[PDB]
Amino acid sequence: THPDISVDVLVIGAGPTGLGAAKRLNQIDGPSWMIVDSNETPGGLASTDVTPEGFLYDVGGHVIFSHYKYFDDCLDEALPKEDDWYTHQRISYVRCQGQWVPYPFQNNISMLPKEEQVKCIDGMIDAALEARVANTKPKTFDEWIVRMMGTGIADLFMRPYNFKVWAVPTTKMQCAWLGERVAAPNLKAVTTNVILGKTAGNWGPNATFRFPARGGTGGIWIAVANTLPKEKTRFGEKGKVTKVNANNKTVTLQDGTTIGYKKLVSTMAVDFLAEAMNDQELVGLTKQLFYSSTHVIGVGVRGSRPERIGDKCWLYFPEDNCPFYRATIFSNYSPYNQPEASKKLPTMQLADGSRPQSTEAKEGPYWSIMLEVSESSMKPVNQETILADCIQGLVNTEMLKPTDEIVSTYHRRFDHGYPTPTLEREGALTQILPKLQDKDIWSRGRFGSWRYEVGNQDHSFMLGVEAVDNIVNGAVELTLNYPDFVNGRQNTERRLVDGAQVFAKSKAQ
Amino acid sequence: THPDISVDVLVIGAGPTGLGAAKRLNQIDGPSWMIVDSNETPGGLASTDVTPEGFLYDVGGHVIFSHYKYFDDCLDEALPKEDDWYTHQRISYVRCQGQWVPYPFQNNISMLPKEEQVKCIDGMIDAALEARVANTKPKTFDEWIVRMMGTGIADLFMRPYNFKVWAVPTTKMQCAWLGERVAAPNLKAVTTNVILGKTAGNWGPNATFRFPARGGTGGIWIAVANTLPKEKTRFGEKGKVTKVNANNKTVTLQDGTTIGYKKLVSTMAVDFLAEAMNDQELVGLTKQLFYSSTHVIGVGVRGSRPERIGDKCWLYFPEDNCPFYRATIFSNYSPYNQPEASKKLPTMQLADGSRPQSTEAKEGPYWSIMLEVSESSMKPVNQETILADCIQGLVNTEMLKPTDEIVSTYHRRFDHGYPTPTLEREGALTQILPKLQDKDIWSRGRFGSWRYEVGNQDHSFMLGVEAVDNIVNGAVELTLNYPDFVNGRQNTERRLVDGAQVFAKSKAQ
Amino acid sequence: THPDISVDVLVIGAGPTGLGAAKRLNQIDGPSWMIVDSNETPGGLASTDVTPEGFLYDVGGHVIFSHYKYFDDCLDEALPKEDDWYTHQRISYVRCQGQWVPYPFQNNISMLPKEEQVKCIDGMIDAALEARVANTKPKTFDEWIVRMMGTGIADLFMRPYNFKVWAVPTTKMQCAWLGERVAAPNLKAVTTNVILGKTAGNWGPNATFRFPARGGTGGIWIAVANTLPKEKTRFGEKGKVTKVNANNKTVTLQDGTTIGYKKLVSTMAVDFLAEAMNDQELVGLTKQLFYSSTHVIGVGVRGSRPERIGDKCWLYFPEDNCPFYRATIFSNYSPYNQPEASKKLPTMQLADGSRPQSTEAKEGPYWSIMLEVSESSMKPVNQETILADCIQGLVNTEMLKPTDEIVSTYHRRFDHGYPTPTLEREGALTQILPKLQDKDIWSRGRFGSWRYEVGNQDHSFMLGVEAVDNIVNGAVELTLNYPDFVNGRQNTERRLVDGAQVFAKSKAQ
Amino acid sequence: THPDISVDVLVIGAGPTGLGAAKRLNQIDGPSWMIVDSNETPGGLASTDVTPEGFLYDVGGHVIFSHYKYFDDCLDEALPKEDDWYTHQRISYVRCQGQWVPYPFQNNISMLPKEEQVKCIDGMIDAALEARVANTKPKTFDEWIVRMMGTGIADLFMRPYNFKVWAVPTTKMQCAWLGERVAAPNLKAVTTNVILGKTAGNWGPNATFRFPARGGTGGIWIAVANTLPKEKTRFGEKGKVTKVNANNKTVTLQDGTTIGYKKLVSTMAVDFLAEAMNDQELVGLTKQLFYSSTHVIGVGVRGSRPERIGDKCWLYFPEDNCPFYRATIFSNYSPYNQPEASKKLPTMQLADGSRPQSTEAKEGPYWSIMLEVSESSMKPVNQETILADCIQGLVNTEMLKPTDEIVSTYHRRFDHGYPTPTLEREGALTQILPKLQDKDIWSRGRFGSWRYEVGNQDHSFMLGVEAVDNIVNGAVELTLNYPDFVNGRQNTERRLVDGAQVFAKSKAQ
Numbered sequence A, B, C, D: 001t002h003p004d005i006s007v008d009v010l011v012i013g014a015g016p017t018g019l020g021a022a023k024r025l026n027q028i029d030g031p032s033w034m035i036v037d038s039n040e041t042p043g044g045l046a047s048t049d050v051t052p053e054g055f056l057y058d059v060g061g062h063v064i065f066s067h068y069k070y071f072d073d074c075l076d077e078a079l080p081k082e083d084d085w086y087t088h089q090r091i092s093y094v095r096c097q098g099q100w101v102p103y104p105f106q107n108n109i110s111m112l113p114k115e116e117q118v119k120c121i122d123g124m125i126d127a128a129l130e131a132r133v134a135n136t137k138p139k140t141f142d143e144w145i146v147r148m149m150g151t152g153i154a155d156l157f158m159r160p161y162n163f164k165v166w167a168v169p170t171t172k173m174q175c176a177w178l179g180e181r182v183a184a185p186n187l188k189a190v191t192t193n194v195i196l197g198k199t200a201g202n203w204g205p206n207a208t209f210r211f212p213a214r215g216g217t218g219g220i221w222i223a224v225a226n227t228l229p230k231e232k233t234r235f236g237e238k239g240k241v242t243k244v245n246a247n248n249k250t251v252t253l254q255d256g257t258t259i260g261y262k263k264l265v266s267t268m269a270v271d272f273l274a275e276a277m278n279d280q281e282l283v284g285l286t287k288q289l290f291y292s293s294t295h296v297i298g299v300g301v302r303g304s305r306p307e308r309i310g311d312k313c314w315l316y317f318p319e320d321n322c323p324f325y326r327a328t329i330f331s332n333y334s335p336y337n338q339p340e341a342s343k344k345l346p347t348m349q350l351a352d353g354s355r356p357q358s359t360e361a362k363e364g365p366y367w368s369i370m371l372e373v374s375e376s377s378m379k380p381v382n383q384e385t386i387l388a389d390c391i392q393g394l395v396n397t398e399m400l401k402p403t404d405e406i407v408s409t410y411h412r413r414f415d416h417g418y419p420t421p422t423l424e425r426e427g428a429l430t431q432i433l434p435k436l437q438d439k440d441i442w443s444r445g446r447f448g449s450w451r452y453e454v455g456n457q458d459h460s461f462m463l464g465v466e467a468v469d470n471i472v473n474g475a476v477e478l479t480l481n482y483p484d485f486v487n488g489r490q491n492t493e494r495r496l497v498d499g500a501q502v503f504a505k506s507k508a509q
Ligand SMILES: [Cl-]
Pocket: A474, A475, A476, B475, B476
């Protein structure tokens, strides 16, 4: 008894990873393939939401910066017109003691009060002298910090902030992931800037970036999926996978439709995957992994963009006068993230939480803020108060004046938000992934392969591409196994049009 | 006016590199392609010669050990029968003061005289204490040695030997190439073995290897080429390339035949390539590169294999009592490298270089030795005395008794022998290679891309494979740009039968 | 009501320290003075005992080596004849696994079995690499060892031996005292000797020494005291101090005699001193100090000196096959330490502990051995079995053959044997000593000032001298406060005849 | 034929050293003794001069701070009245780029311009990282500096200043003398003060000091000598030593008087001593020593003490806009160093070097400045222009306004000023001193024993004391042989009234 549908390569999930697989499969045009997703709209965590008032809110204000030329080719193909994109310079600060400290914090001590300046440069002189002599290697995130930064910067910013975002103490996670995330402060450069009162905030791959004019990031993946053959897609309740039988290589959908495959590329959360396989063993293994939930909070406000805010992009909040670890001036990314000035909206409340003087609709214009709050078994949150708490914090930090008029509110909780790089991670992955591989299953993605080091949109897209390239042309999966390798180079070899296609075209003629 | 022949991808040279290109082109079966070589017999430097007496002699006694599963697949395909191959354990020693010191030398100080033992462990204690504190990096080969080994091992073996083989002083070459060539001695392990009088010679990828039963290594590449479509090859005076016009992408052969190409894979020496292009600039660049010539000397001798020699494979000779830097007991690799016992041969001379007592042709059996002597502008040799000199050295080292009967002699000089890893190398390559790339020319191979780190047979084969995989499927050329990456891992992803081929068969059916 | 006797400077105790005080007082001939001791025979711990059979036994076989020229002057004065002294070369070994390892142990690894050789040179390479980089300081004896020697030499000899002698673990004592006691092994020198199989045993101030012909060391201090004016001494039950009243500066003897003083030099144990003062506070302070008791065991044996023993002086026994930590071939120091060959003595028992064949007395000659066994609250001993145990150990170590005839036995327990350099020591001394100083009381000596670093006979003698020189001419007490200073130099300034005397005798005439 | 005079101990020179010898000789009252000097007024380099206008000028503005309680006793005895002494807090600065940098310079980088601040903290971070790893020792003064300070502070202040004072480059002197002279900057403390803009100038034994009310320092040694028995002194042309016959221990004075001695204490310059002995050998040895001459310049000026100067004591001048290396506000030490306000004096010239408008005698009050200029064969000076040059420099540094009225000028050149701690010094001393010792000659003092480390007034006094204490009571000469020992402790043992005298007094009664 055959299955209803049979293909060479089946792709579960239409996030950036699944779509990466589809794109290369479609470019190659060899093996038969199909892609499914439980949602009518492709995009996954990189999709966009909208309030009844007309305010767009991503899942933490995503920003596009690419390590791969192939990733660029697909974006250019889906959104080829100049006015589809905005190019921005990164403006980021850290809130510490009534001060905006330029990112990255550890490179701009010259912007702290004199007292803290002293405590930071002292712990940093200590660390520099020991690091001159050490020959072992840091084993925890906390160790890495102390050795690279000093106990001063650690107690002032690093320790408190990272718990506020990762939802676990720095002592409980590894330090092999931060190659391109955490800057390592140079003693000379930092004290030279303290003496001269200068800043240095060009560090990182974030320095410059771009953002889609309309639809947010979610609009990118809708455009990208539109380049695929409709008949090879299956999005919605009709494409929801509820069972995976690795032994006879068949998938069962929600409606009972069965699909047979030779190779499986699964981009759903690995822990859900194991559950869908009824594989008691893999379940016991996945439960050894750790993740944190993400609360996204959106606030629409009336008025021209205050100068107290200016051209700021995103901001970190280590202190405990607010529940969120970051805030984004979303309205700065594109004028289409919020209604036009001519649209009339009523005031729901003032920043201080009281009612408005007038229950009528008035003109704008408007600007928008979005916040993020982390949660775990080590850091619970109260959903029915988190929204109000976030607004209070906006006042306590002077983001909003108590009299500022709030026009729109937004709150959503994403269960799987961050793949936590705990100490136990690699212990579980080096078992889980190979075991799945032996069943011809390539589990890839942010929660497919569970590796933050390489868990951005471009990374995920390429995890899908390379998985397919591995199944078809026997390419090595560099992104999955060698983060530091891909992240440290310009990946310019693989293109949306390779020689294989050019030589096929010149043949057909 | 069109060219006589036109193909998508043209491959110049049928050495291991050229044949690697052909093999993957043929496996993919997409773009049109052709391969040419100036010699009727494919194999290049990995080919075999024969004396009128029936003695086989490689080009320095080559040995097969593979980093790539794909390389294995092709070898298994060409020589699929068990009795086509012999598997050997590496037996190698170094001649120092009437002693056979187990390879690698620096790990077996426990086998030197007491006096030298002391001078070696002293310089090695010094180096170990400084290396505990250094934070810079060695810039020359000589520095690397002193830092990793000590001044004792350097003056006793490293310095004198390396000049004897590389044909230039250690102070004039870099140290980025030796990752898998030069062992780094551990202080504890070495002194622990000096106290206990033990050996340690398992180090390196040479430990175990295999060798073809018939035809030497040259037989492998003849078998491999036989798997290609004859009509797509052109070997002999008819396939010799005498002109390359990069501007209009045409090659001109010896007979005047012209070939047009879209992509060019050239495996000939890069300096000859530049000359064939009449590109004055590239010529001036190539001349900045450095290489050494190789003299191969073969000696056939009568008698059962002496016990003074036993199951020895190859031997290094640092001292100055002989001109050669290495010697191979070729007759140990396969019984088919020399005549059978029943064959009758006359004696040409005795080891001491005097006439034999009998000129009459007698039976055997026989064994065989081959030697290597390096040459450069920094180390000239006398061709008309080198043969005699080599034999004398065989006596001075007690390899041959002065009365041993010599049945066959062999001598040949290969101009391009070693690609010298000088200090100036990367300065020239980072210009030459990219400039050729801009003309759609992939120059690859031992003297195609000129990188010893990755200049073995398997390496070369894969430089050709990956070049093609780059032109067609946009794969990254890992071997060419990341020697330490490929050399440190098991490259098991790329096979002779990939999914693209598996799927295409199940589709035809 | 005046005291029966009144002097400027009173000296309690006629040990080497007390006698040092007396000697300088007598040389200066200024202030009035008197010296008392509870024993008819002066000498203290440096006195000698005798068995009814005619065997001399010191208190652990003392050996004379001087840091001070002044100490030499007094010895030359008391024993001026060439034949009063024997000069010896130090012959010392350590018993480890059926081997005699030349002193010092850590400098002669070349004399251990091959297996232990490896374990010792490994821990020593580790230590040498860390010591290259450390910048802190060792805080315990155990730390000092590990850092200077390695964990190999520590577990094999250092740790077990030191507990066997000090009667407390190495982890519970400081490391400021070992400057001239514990050798610091040089990595180069030690491995150079392991390769060549050489020894190095010239280290220390013990290398060469002398020993008195008659009476043992006790004979020296009897001769020295004989140079003092009899009327200023008071030795015996008549000189025993039973009460010290610091407030009104009076001492009360056993017979009720009272002595008044201006300055007091007390050489008795500081803890007994505090008790004699009825000073509740000082008592509580002294009890914070730590000491170990010493068991001295003497064995006289018949026969010419075996060659298994030869010219050996003293030997250390780290292993647990015997209770003693050291043994001395006392009969080697002087022919007068035991009876002459012509003396007839009966056999008491054989080494194996069995009855003798005959009771009748027979000639000699004889040789002698003395042993030392430590005791503390951390290491109890059984007095009524220790003698037998010691003999058994002499058999287990092959010092005596089970059939060797024992002629004389000796056993005595000295309560205050070693001033233990615990971690708490300096904490108590820096309080006790100054508090006594404020009452014009100079407490000096092995148990007077309780500092092993400077607790040899010459040290003690000079503690007395310098105390008097401090009271009279305001000299600094270098020996008491700066052990490393005096021990590292040739103290040649102070003589038995200073300019004062030579200038006063040229005055009279 | 006997000498005219005979004593046990003869002391040549009545400087602080000679007088120290006399004082202890007189206190002991044993051996006979006598002290001679070529000058009617005792004091040596520690004496005071006076201008016809009534201005006192020392030999570089001397300042009293004591390491020895014995030194205090003698000063208290000679000047026992409270109002004989003034107690001062040290106020010292360094002139660098129109800035007064608090002493010590290296500890107050926080007071330099921003540009120099950076160059100093950079070289200091380098040095701190290397010093973390070094295990050798600095061999030259220059090395010591670079290692302890950095190349920044070295080029800015250390190198140029030290040549200006020592009269030789820093590369030509040793670094064993600076223990209590040159501060070693702590990286943390210095950057902590740069961030906070604080100062730290409590370092050194100079922090607090005292100064005699009248007569300058010269008044101290006149008072001290007045405590000696006149008949045992011989000061003036009658006490000038012109010949020393070590062989028959006799000294010949200027008038022909001969003195016989048993022990000789010579405080004159060791090179002059050798000359007076006619000892060709010692002469050749002394000439291997190095010294620099000192020019003292005194300037008296009219007016109330400007505020531009305030309570400043002494100031260093590294820059090249003036010839002097230091300046002292002598009028701040005591109101008796210059005339009273009521005294009338004519103006000799204005600071700018031009005539005054008035050849007229007017009132005061007045203040005083004295300068020091070094000279050697490596740094010549022009005597007939140095006075003018010094005044010009006072203007260029803004010490004096060009219009300031000069009332008194003073200039004198002292040939032997500084005992240069060259590299060759200890090579010569370890020969010269012992050779003299073998002739019963204690050569002590600034130029007697030639050791700057211990060349202050208190040091010199004690060199004399200890020399006598050595000759008489056999005390060790700690000061002469162990600078770091005496300088690092409180020498409280030796008093002007020792027990020998207390006991001798209670006996006479
Ligand atoms: Cl690949």
